[PDB]
DNA sequence: GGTCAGAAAATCGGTTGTGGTCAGCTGCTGCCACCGGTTAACCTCCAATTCTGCTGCCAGCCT
């Protein structure tokens, strides 16, 4: 329980709470075992009517399970250059 | 065949009157988002080169 209630509070960057993380993983955990037998990749429909959510909700939980990704990185892949320096 | 009260114009402004009108909370009420605690068969040790300076190390004259 300490350990799975720390890795919630604090694997990433934007806190999310608890209870949405339950989600989170639950709507993981759904979407893996539904492609696993369906042999494509579920409809947002098809997670909805699984999960007893509407796909509006289901919209809203894949969208607050986005990490950021770093200003840091060199997205010239010669090196010369990094993401923070081509942005308005 | 000329002077004085009344009537009739906007005009600047006060009343006023109510007719909504919009917000400012105000409960309040349901709800929903979020934080905290709890679960009792057992099973107890990790995933390239070039140059300069510094430190560790071993033989070996000197006392």
New binding site residues.
């Given amino acids: 329980?300490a350990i799975t209630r720390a890795m919630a509070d604090q694997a990433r960057t934007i806190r999310i709470?608890?209870?949405?993380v339950e989600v989170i993983n639950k709507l993981g955990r759904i979407q893996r075992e539904l492609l696993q037998d369906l042999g494509r990749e579920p409809t947002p429909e098809e997670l909805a009517k699984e999960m007893d959510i509407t796909p509006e909700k289901v919209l809203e939980i894949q969208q607050y399970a986005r990490e950021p990704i770093s200003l840091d990185q060199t997205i010239g892949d010669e090196g010369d250059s990094q993401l923070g320096d081509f942005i308005e």
């Fill in positions: 329980q709470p608890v209870h949405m």
